[PDB]
Write a protein that binds this ligand. Structure first.
Ligand SMILES: Nc1ccn([C@@H]2O[C@H](COP(=O)(O)O)[C@@H](O)[C@H]2O)c(=O)n1
Ligand SMILES: Nc1ccn([C@@H]2O[C@H](COP(=O)(O)O)[C@@H](O)[C@H]2O)c(=O)n1
Ligand SMILES: Nc1ccn([C@@H]2O[C@H](COP(=O)(O)O)[C@@H](O)[C@H]2O)c(=O)n1
Ligand SMILES: [Zn+2]
Ligand SMILES: [Zn+2]
Ligand SMILES: [Zn+2]
Length: 471
């Protein structure tokens, strides 16, 4: 990939001009944002930026831009809608249901290849050469929107990076694309620092043995999922296992890094996993050490915890400095992490007996054993736990809140699988059109909803469609 950065920024400036037309008239800005760290930070960036202009706004945090959602937004009397961190795969639907409204899409998903009307403006870095999961996230698009609207919005650079980390834009251990420009803005203001550190959840709030035991991206062999063994390993290497990572000296951190790298090599971990163990970690002196907001991944996890309970609006308030919202959000992270480890335990126990393996895909139907909103994490964990061939994409389906006749599915894969030609977003979109469902997303990570009774048909279909992508 390679971004035309100034061309993208000129498109951003075009959207800023449109939103200013509505601010002048006192129009309330309707905001629809994705239910994850990327979308929650996106909405907070818009809330702070519009607040600086004295404009009013109304935020909803949602899972997807569905035809049903757009039917609802069609009847709302707002004059302008901003979709942030989602929507680029729903341009035809937005064109239909919001035809007589002004729409701004601040997003980084692979855009639907259709023509938009004059009052609908897509602001998407992928259209200017970006890799959708690496060069900029939804919070990043929203950040540059806010920055062009008012230069004072550069103080949102850390919140923007929180969304990027939540979206795993530094999944290979380093930041890329225009995320590096946001980082430079934040450094100039002194509100963020980039450290070369252990890229695991728990730098601020977890004891070291839980930082190691929670590691699923990448896993630490023999230690992941076993706090007792994590304690034994840490003590044997000379570390107080109850200490938090932020309490280690820089000398002690580097010693831990060496021990972990040697451990992964001795247990045969792959080069890709070793390379993303140590890398860019973003902290912020705006918050105290030991506070999850002090580090981007802990902050993103805190926001994801509010989204999981359908309290994304509380996550927005956390980003905006509401300390009472922060105290509530702290109480949601423990159940969030515990359920992920339980999902991994179920996968290890049931993968061999339940998974359907085609020529180009694994399809796992977990029934009700894993929450519908966790099937994506589960698919990724099947790869990281070594259950799945890294070159074969994994799709996990579960029963879902949304509909008793529906299955919610998530697809995940690796960069080496993408090198073979697979594109999960495109494959799921095309398969959904044939089994009376709905799907799409990134090449490396995508979602789909299908009727439960069409699962067997879907498995054969998606295997064939993925195979046709193999060049
Ligand atoms: N392999 C993986 C994949 C996801 N996760 C968790 O899932 C969260 C969000 O995952 P998605 O980006 O797939 O929605 C991450 O921030 C992390 O807490 C994990 O712990 N291990
Ligand atoms: N119909 C769909 C379903 C999911 N997606 C995208 O696919 C990605 C992964 O989906 P899940 O998080 O639902 O597994 C998300 O970025 C989501 O916005 C999409 O663009 N169109
Ligand atoms: N290298 C990467 C980068 C992102 N991802 C996934 O891509 C998705 C991006 O989230 P959105 O669809 O919400 O933008 C997340 O599920 C994230 O875990 C990945 O699976 N591998
Ligand atoms: Zn260039
Ligand atoms: Zn998102
Ligand atoms: Zn995103």
């Amino acid at each position: 990939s390679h971004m035309d950065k100034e061309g993208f920024l000129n498109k951003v400036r075009e959207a800023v001009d449109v939103v200013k037309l509505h601010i002048e008239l006192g129009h309330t800005i309707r905001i629809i944002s994705h239910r994850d760290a990327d979308g929650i930070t996106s909405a907070a960036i818009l809330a702070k930026a519009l607040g600086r202009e004295g404009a009013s706004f109304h935020i909803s945090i949602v899972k997807q831009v569905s035809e049903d959602l757009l039917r609802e937004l069609k009847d709302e009397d707002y004059k302008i809608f901003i979709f942030s961190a989602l929507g680029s795969g729903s341009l035809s639907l937005i064109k239909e249901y919001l035809k007589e409204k002004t729409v701004i899409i601040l997003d980084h998903h692979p855009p639907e290849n259709v023509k938009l009307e004059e009052k609908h403006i897509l602001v998407n870095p992928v259209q200017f050469g970006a890799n959708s999961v690496r060069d900029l996230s939804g919070s990043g698009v929203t950040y540059f929107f806010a920055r062009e609207l008012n230069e004072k919005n550069r103080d949102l650079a850390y919140i923007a990076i929180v969304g990027a980390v939540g979206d795993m834009q530094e999944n290979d251990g380093v930041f890329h694309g225009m995320n590096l420009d946001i980082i430079e803005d934040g450094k100039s203001l002194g509100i963020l620092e980039v450290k070369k550190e252990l890229r695991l959840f728990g730098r601020e709030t977890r004891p070291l043995y839980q930082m190691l035991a929670y590691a699923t991206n990448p896993e630490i062999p023999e230690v992941t999922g076993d706090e007792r063994k994590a304690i034994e390993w840490l003590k044997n290497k000379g570390f107080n296992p109850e200490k938090k990572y932020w309490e280690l000296s820089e000398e002690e951190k580097k010693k831990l890094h060496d021990f972990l790298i040697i451990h992964m090599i001795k247990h045969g971990a792959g080069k890709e996993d070793i390379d993303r163990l140590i890398g860019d970690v973003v902290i912020s002196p705006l918050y105290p050490e030991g506070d999850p907001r002090h580090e981007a991944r802990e902050f993103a996890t805190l926001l994801n915890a509010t989204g999981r309970l359908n309290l994304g609006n509380l996550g927005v308030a956390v980003c905006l400095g509401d300390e009472e919202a922060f105290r509530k959000a702290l109480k949601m992270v423990e159940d969030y992490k515990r359920e992920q480890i339980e999902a991994r335990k179920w996968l290890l126990q049931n993968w061999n007996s339940e998974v359907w393996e085609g020529d180009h895909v694994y399809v796992l139907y977990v029934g009700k054993s894993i929450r519908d909103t966790l099937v994506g994490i589960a698919a990724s964990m099947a790869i990281n736990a070594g259950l799945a061939d890294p070159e074969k994409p994994v799709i996990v389906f579960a029963d879902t809140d949304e509909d008793p006749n529906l299955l919610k599915g998530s697809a995940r894969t690796t960069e080496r699988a993408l090198a073979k030609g697979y594109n999960l977003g495109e494959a799921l979109r095309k398969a959904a059109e044939l089994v009376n469902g709905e799907g799409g997303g990134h090449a490396i990570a995508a979602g789909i909803r299908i009727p439960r009774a069409r699962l067997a048909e879907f498995r054969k279909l998606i295997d064939k469609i993925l195979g046709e992508q193999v060049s």
